[PDB]
């Protein structure tokens, strides 16, 4: 299937209680592999997946140097943004950054991302062409102007199309047992009376990887989109995911209902009956 590498950066100002918090996490697909936390003892990029632990000291030293440089940039950025919006030093503010690359099933570049939010709102984004910038207000236009003058987009493009794809391929190869695995959903159905005239059918998908899944109920072969309780896909905490979908079935009508499960690990979609 397709694959992604993403980095997620959270920078939070703490006006009274010392330096801004900085958290960095890196993911390949749905698997976290690294973290940095400004408040932690190590002050190092740390491994969070077994397969990256085998990268040697040059790797860890280089990722530590870069994550600290990122951290320092974000520390300045909180001050710059305050200035741009004429905000006081009183309030806590949040800067978020995300960047990375998508490859298709051929492991060739599909798309790149490099984008920011301030206080939960889009600030500036590199557009899909990787040549131009989406700025929604005059603050972001000021960032855009400086970055167009310094040819930032060209430097980001070379990373997103080159380095990002090369390292994602290296990770997919080195972490093959973890990252290229497909865990097909383990499925079950439960039935629970709610009154004397209706019952809940709940269709479960457990222990699957990756997270992408489609879980749908049909009545007489008609999708129940509007009449299905569907929970958000959730982590089990062992690197697998869970989901369920539930329908309220009036008395005697259980046999009208089918649960349909689609996942990369299912050669054929499942149809499940009570």
């Amino acid at each position: 299937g397709s694959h992604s590498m993403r980095y997620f950066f959270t920078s939070v100002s703490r006006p009274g209680r010392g330096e801004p918090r900085f958290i960095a996490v890196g993911y390949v697909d749905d698997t976290q592999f690294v973290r940095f936390d400004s408040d932690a003892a190590s002050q190092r990029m740390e491994p969070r997946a077994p397969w990256i632990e085998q990268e040697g000291p040059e790797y860890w030293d280089g990722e530590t140097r870069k994550v600290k440089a990122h951290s320092q940039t974000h520390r300045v950025d909180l001050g710059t943004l305050r200035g741009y919006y004429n905000q006081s030093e009183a309030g806590s503010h949040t800067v978020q950054r995300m960047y990375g690359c998508d490859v298709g099933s051929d492991w060739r570049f599909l798309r790149g991302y490099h984008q920011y939010a301030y206080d939960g709102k889009d600030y500036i984004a590199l557009k899909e062409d990787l040549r131009s910038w989406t700025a929604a207000d005059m603050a972001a236009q000021t960032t855009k102007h400086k970055w167009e003058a310094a040819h930032v987009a060209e430097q980001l493009r070379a990373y997103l199309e080159g380095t990002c794809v090369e390292w994602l391929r290296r990770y997919l190869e080195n972490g093959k047992e973890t990252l290229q695995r497909t865990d097909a959903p383990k499925t079950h159905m439960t039935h629970h009376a709610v009154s004397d005239h209706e019952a809940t059918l709940r269709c479960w998908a457990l222990s699957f990887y990756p997270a992408e899944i489609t879980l749908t109920w049909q009545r007489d072969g008609e999708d129940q989109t509007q009449d299905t309780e569907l929970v958000e896909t959730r982590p089990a905490g062992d690197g697998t995911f869970q989901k369920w979908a539930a329908v309220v079935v009036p008395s005697g009508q259980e046999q009208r209902y089918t649960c349909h499960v689609q996942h990369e690990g299912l050669p054929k979609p499942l149809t499940l009956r009570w």
Partner: peptide, 9 residues
Amino acid sequence: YLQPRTFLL
């Protein structure tokens, strides 16, 4: 593998 260069807002 992080971006080796950072750019101020």
